[PDB]
Structures are given as structure tokens and as C-alpha cells.
Write a protein that binds this ligand. Structure first.
Ligand SMILES: C[C@@H](c1cccc2c(-c3ccc(CS(C)(=O)=O)c(F)c3)c(C(=O)O)[nH]c12)n1cc(CNC(=O)[C@@H](N)CO)nn1
Ligand SMILES: [Zn+2]
Ligand SMILES: [Zn+2]
Length: 232
């Protein structure tokens, strides 16, 4: 009833939306992985009379539920989606999107990693993002490759109209006491990648992590802190 959604409000298979700013929502869903339940976030950005989706809802049935929730709450068609790295919380559901007519995109690095891991593969390759510090425009957002962090391919997304920074899984929530699932991470490079984000988007007003509660710019420094404590 207005607070940011959590698993206790989200059974696995359900999706809730949260208004972040004018024309910007996050989506929240829950999924089980290795016998534990996790929330995860994505983004929705209004693109005139269409919508741009950032990340799936972590699974085929969750992503179908996401589309139904968007139709209920917003009522504009999702025409394009970008996945911000290769893990199932970002690409699991791309097949559902593609069968619902959504054009799916990711960097070539994400597409190769997804293919090698056996995860769903976005259709279209996003060039111009292969070097750290690169940025490209994609509808109403900017896509930015900060360097390796949570994964080698992770992208962040900025909504300039609203100064919303969607950090994806390279950014953790303030309450986090650990650095999440780091199996594919570069813990040594991650702080440098976070510093690049901080330098590029100093006017960000909302910062959204890949999992957990949005906050402000403090999430970036907190992420560097929890990652450093993990490495050590
Ligand atoms: C699907 C993804 C995955 C699944 C389950 C959990 C997560 C987490 C995670 C975990 C804990 C917290 C709370 S916290 C910050 O307080 O710690 C959190 F916020 C996010 C993240 C992430 O951090 O983004 N992502 C996860 N995922 C990752 C991998 C890597 N590979 C493996 O795990 C191998 N065993 C192969 O299976 N594969 N899928
Ligand atoms: Zn991940
Ligand atoms: Zn994640």
C-alpha cells in the first residue's frame, strides 16, 4: 500500500510495480534459486506512447505476470527490452518477451555469456558499449558500461528526464551486509567501476539496485564498501 515491495508482499510468480518518477517505474518479483527466495528489480520507462523495459522479472512465468501487470497498471505496449547482464534475473523471460512481440536487446558480451551459460539470449546486439566508460542512447535512457563489477558485462541505465540511475546488480541496497552472488564478479575491479558510475552520474537523485530498496547516491559508496569487505 505504497511502501517499496518486498517478498513478504511478493509470492513467487507475482509482480508489483513501483512509481519512481514521472514516466519511470521499477518492477519487483521474487524467485527461488538454490533453495532460497530472493527479490529482484527491473525498470520501465515511458517512451511516448510505448514502454521500454529494462530486465526481465526473473523467469518465464514471472515475466508473463510482469506483462500482465504493466497492462493493468500502465496500459501502454512494451516494445523493446534491454537486459543489463547475462544472469537469469536479467534474461530469464526473454523468450516470453520475444513471443509477446517485444524486441530484446543486450550487449554482444551479454549475448555471448548467456549463450555459453545456457540462458535465454536477447535477439539484438547493442554496439558501442565494449569499453569501460562507453555510453549510448536507447530511447529515453542512456546505457553505460562502467567496467567489470558484479559481472564483466554489467550495464547501468540512466533516465536523464528524471535523474534516475538504475544500477542493476552492480549496485546493492543500503541494508546489504554482503555483496550478493559474486560467482561471476570481479571484486578487485568493482570499486573502480563504481567510481566511474559516480563520476558519470553525479546528479542522480534516485539509485535503484538490482535487488532490494532504491535510495540515493549513498548506494554507490555502500556498494564499494560491501564489495571491499567481501574481497577481504
Ligand atoms: C540469478 C542470479 C542470482 C541467484 C540467486 C541470488 C542472487 C543474487 C543476490 C544474493 C543475495 C543478495 C542479498 S545481499 C546483497 O545482502 O548479499 C542479493 F541482493 C542478491 C544476485 C546478485 O547479487 O545480483 N544474483 C543472484 N545468479 C547469479 C549467478 C552466478 N552463478 C552461481 O551462482 C553458480 N552457483 C552457478 O549456478 N547465477 N545466477
Ligand atoms: Zn547477476
Ligand atoms: Zn542480480
Amino acid at each position: 500500500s505504497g511502501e517499496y515491495p518486498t517478498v513478504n508482499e511478493i509470492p513467487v510468480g507475482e509482480v508489483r510495480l513501483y512509481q519512481i518518477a514521472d514516466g519511470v517505474w521499477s518492477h519487483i518479483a521474487t524467485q527461488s534459486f538454490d533453495g532460497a527466495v530472493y527479490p529482484s528489480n527491473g525498470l520501465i520507462v515511458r517512451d511516448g506512447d510505448e514502454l521500454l523495459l529494462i530486465d526481465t522479472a526473473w523467469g518465464a512465468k514471472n515475466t508473463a505476470a510482469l506483462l500482465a501487470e504493466i497492462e493493468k497498471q500502465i496500459g501502454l505496449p512494451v516494445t523493446r527490452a534491454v537486459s543489463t547482464h547475462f544472469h537469469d534475473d536479467r534474461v530469464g523471460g526473454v523468450d516470453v518477451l520475444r513471443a509477446a512481440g517485444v524486441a530484446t536487446y543486450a550487449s554482444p558480451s551479454t549475448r555471448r555469456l548467456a549463450e555459453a551459460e545456457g540462458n535465454e539470449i536477447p535477439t539484438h546486439s547493442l554496439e558501442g558499449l565494449s569499453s569501460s566508460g562507453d555510453a549510448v542512447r536507447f530511447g529515453p535512457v542512456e546505457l553505460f558500461y562502467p567496467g567489470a563489477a558484479h559481472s564483466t558485462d554489467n550495464l547501468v541505465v540512466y533516465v536523464p528526464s528524471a535523474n534516475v540511475l538504475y544500477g542493476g546488480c552492480a549496485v546493492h541496497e543500503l541494508s546489504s551486509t554482503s555483496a550478493g552472488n559474486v560467482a561471476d564478479a570481479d571484486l578487485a575491479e568493482w570499486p573502480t567501476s563504481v567510481e566511474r558510475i559516480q563520476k558519470h552520474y553525479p546528479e542522480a537523485e534516485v539509485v535503484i539496485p538490482g535487488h532490494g530498496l532504491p535510495g540515493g547516491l549513498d548506494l554507490l559508496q555502500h556498494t564499494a564498501n560491501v564489495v571491499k569487505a567481501h574481497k577481504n
